[PDB]
Amino acid sequence: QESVKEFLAKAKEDFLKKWENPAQNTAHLDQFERIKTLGTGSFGRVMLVKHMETGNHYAMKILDKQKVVKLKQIEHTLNEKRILQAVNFPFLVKLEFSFKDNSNLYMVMEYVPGGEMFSHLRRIGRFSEPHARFYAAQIVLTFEYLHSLDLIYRDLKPENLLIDQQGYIQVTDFGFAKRVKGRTWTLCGTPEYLAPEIILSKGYNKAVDWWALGVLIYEMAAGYPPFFADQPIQIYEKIVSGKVRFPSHFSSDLKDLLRNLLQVDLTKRFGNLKNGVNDIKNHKWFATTDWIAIYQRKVEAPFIPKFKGPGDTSNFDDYEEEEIRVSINEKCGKEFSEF
């Protein structure tokens, strides 16, 4: 346990050095061949690219500056890259390069070829408890790391968990994570994953990530989330009600864990008590979990994705392609100076 403390202190030193002096302008668009769109978002898309000097493949996020400014998201997008370039953990996707041009912001990161957990979950329907537990353990350790750095992720969901070659998770899309020691107030997240204190326009803290873990574990094990309805307003009513029902096949240990993660009173929620993350790590549902072995990636993964060599994108769905347009005039230069 002192070994955890030592590790986290060194991790904070490493993070803060990068956080305080972020890397800028480490590549250029012309160094990459654009191959395929792997996903989309509000201001752009993530594409498979090939670094032409080496032949190595990466995933490149491309954001249109003018679209970001239109939706008033300068601060979140700057912060996304600042976080990505500063963190270092086995289950966080690794930034390789970043740069900007007249039109766009670019983040070149590790290509994670196994596809989104969302894909696999919807395809299989649901995961066994051991399979779900394998993935949950990785998220527990990732939040221990992130929370030690005062980072609230705020967007946990299968859509953001990519599966690598070894069947382990890489978390992506830090597009509105926030570094704050105490509380914050913005309405942010994805409806099914929002903790009640967010919905109710209260102050909230990193405990919202532990609520979201409860949602994720439920969704992984059941195949559908604990709270759903046709429209977000109705989902929010279910979330604040404090009423969750479990499938007949959920174990007693799993139900007990979920009741403590999906605890509406944040002062009683696991992960937010005096013993912090250790209440989760020591819970009976995790009794077979060797936490060091998960961190070390020494546990055999329950699902190893098909991969046919470098650049294979067979685990990703198909998106309409657009050629990248770069304006002859610089757009929003002052606004994105720090990127």
Binding site: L187, T190, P191, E192, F228
Partner: peptide, 20 residues
């Protein structure tokens, strides 16, 4: 069943984040 309710919800696809 709860599964049937989930399919009926229309929220089986990828879900976007929200804000004000």
């Amino acid at each position: 069943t709860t599964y049937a309710d989930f399919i009926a919800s229309g929220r089986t696809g990828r879900r976007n984040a929200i804000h004000d």
